[PDB]
């Protein structure tokens, strides 16, 4: 499989940006494989 990269732009903060999304407070666990799962 050919896995390759291609440039997609500069890394810059945008002034006066659209603000969205909430700020959830979640209890999670992280396993040794890197999986995050909600603690039920």
């Amino acid at each position: 499989v050919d896995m390759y990269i291609e440039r997609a732009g500069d890394i810059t903060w945008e002034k006066d940006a659209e603000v969205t999304g909430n700020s959830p407070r979640l209890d999670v666990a992280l396993d040794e494989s890197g999986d995050f799962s909600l603690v039920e």
Binding site: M3, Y4, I5, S23, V28, F36, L38
Partner: protein, 155 residues
């Protein structure tokens, strides 16, 4: 071939290409999430980028050298996801992170939902420094997504 910036990570076989992720070139090192590349080598033009550092538990991998991204979320301020979705130009989305509370401490987390191939897009502080990569997280009850702000250690 290693000019600073954000990059798409693509795969191609015999037919068209698929965007599997995104990453950051900084200081000659390419930074992405492990699940994007599974830790395999990358092509950049006519060059080959070899895996150097990585950690499946952090879901991170660097190419050509050790992890270079050292900036940390300040635990207070709004951040921007520089989302690079498949088939769309980079766009900045500002948000106030929430928190993944774990037994080992808190991790900032962003409630922003993008296609799987947006994995590895950088999350920025107001100085434009990369404070982590987007795309390892959880799906909450209503089906929406929350990503950790995943950052590595600069040794």
């Amino acid at each position: 071939e290693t000019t600073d910036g954000v990059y798409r990570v693509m795969t191609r076989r015999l037919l068209g290409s698929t965007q599997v992720g995104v990453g950051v070139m900084q200081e000659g090192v390419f930074h992405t999430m492990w699940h994007v590349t599974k830790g395999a080598a990358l092509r950049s033009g006519e060059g080959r980028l070899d895996p150097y550092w990585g950690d499946v538990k952090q879901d991170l991998v660097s190419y050509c050298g050790p992890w270079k991204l050292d900036a940390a979320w300040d635990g207070l301020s709004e951040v921007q996801l520089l989302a690079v979705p498949p088939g769309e130009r980079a766009k900045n989305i500002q948000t106030l992170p929430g928190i993944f509370k774990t037994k080992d401490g808190d991790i900032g987390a962003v409630a922003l939902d993008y296609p799987a191939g947006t994995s590895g897009s950088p999350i920025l502080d107001k100085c434009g420094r990369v404070i982590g990569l987007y795309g390892n997280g959880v799906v909450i009850k209503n089906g929406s997504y929350v990503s950790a702000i995943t950052q590595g250690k600069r040794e």
